[PDB]
Amino acid sequence: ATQNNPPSWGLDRIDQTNLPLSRSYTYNSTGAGVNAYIIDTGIYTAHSDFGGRATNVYDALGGNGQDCNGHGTHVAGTVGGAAYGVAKAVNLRGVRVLNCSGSGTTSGVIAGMNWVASNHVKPAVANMSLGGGYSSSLNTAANNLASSGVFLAVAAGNETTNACNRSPASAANATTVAASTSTDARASYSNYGSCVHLYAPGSSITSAWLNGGTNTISGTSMATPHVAGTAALYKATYGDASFSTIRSWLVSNATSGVITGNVSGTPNLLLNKRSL
Ligand SMILES: [Ca+2]
Numbered sequence: 269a270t271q272n273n274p275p276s277w278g279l280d281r282i283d284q285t286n287l288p289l290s291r292s293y294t295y296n297s298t299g300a301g302v303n304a305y306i307i308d309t310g311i312y313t314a315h316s317d318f319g320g321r322a323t324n325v326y327d328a329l330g331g332n333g334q335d336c337n338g339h340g341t342h343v344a345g346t347v348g349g350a351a352y353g354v355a356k357a358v359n360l361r362g363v364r365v366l367n368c369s370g371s372g373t374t375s376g377v378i379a380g381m382n383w384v385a386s387n388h389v390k391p392a393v394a395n396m397s398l399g400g401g402y403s404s405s406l407n408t409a410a411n412n413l414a415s416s417g418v419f420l421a422v423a424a425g426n427e428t429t430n431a432c433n434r435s436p437a438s439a440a441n442a443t444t445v446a447a448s449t450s451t452d453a454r455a456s457y458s459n460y461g462s463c464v465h466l467y468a469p470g471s472s473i474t475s476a477w478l479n480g481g482t483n484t485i486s487g488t489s490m491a492t493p494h495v496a497g498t499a500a501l502y503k504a505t506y507g508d509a510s511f512s513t514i515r516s517w518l519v520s521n522a523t524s525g526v527i528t529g530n531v532s533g534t535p536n537l538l539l540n541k542r543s544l
Pocket residue numbers: 279280281282283284289290291292293294
């Protein structure tokens with residue numbers, strides 16, 4: 269199937285090797301039957317772009333799982349919204365670890381990851397569009413979440429710093445995602461370095477929001493769900509596979525050398541789902 273004139277350029281970009289944008293997003297899986305765990309501010313599950321496919325399954329803060337920020341709804345939309353998403357029929361499963369202003373703690377994030385590792389329904393992917401300072405406990409938790417069978421996509425971060433200095437971006441088993449722009453530039457805020465595995469569209473990404481509507485925002489938070497969604501397409505297309513197999517497929521099939529302004533020591537690779 270082909271979505272003509274997708275409402276976010278990020279979808280357009282990941283289905284082709286070179287600019288110019290084709291104003292189209294082609295997909296041959298929808299990720300049906302794959303579970304995508306959005307570890308974030310929760311999901312506004314009633315949004316029309318989710319159909320009936322979004323349900324919150326855990327809240328680390330003692331709340332009801334519902335998004336009261338918008339960020340997690342936006343991220344969920346890029347993973348799996350009908351109009352805004354990469355994997356348009358995936359099951360979206362909200363894991364609320366951040367509050368109404370988009371913040372939390374290392375321990376609440378680990379609680380959400382622990383829930384997903386224990387209770388995920390295979391085949392499963394997880395998206396972590398969040399980060400903080402380096403934490404050995406958070407990195408270990410991320411490594412064991414991936415090893416439990418959940419492909420793990422994490423944001424490199426928006427601090428213009430080395431992602432090896434941040435967690436969970438620096439975890440060995442993460443697939444860590446930097447942000448590009450619609451001209452294939454490195455986004456000015458994007459973290460960089462040897463702990464980044466590839467770029468994905470991150471600046472001015474349009475997706476779902478709290479108010480029933482849309483929002484266009486920027487960040488490695490927006491790049492990461494393109495990768496999580498592609499991993500969900502992978503599992504629906506080929507069957508379940510380990511995080512290391514899918515990560516290797518992503519980086520070897522990524523578009524090489526098109527990012528401008530890349531920071532030397534960072535892979536010049538851009539997410540490319542064409543070969544699915
Ligand atoms: Ca395209």
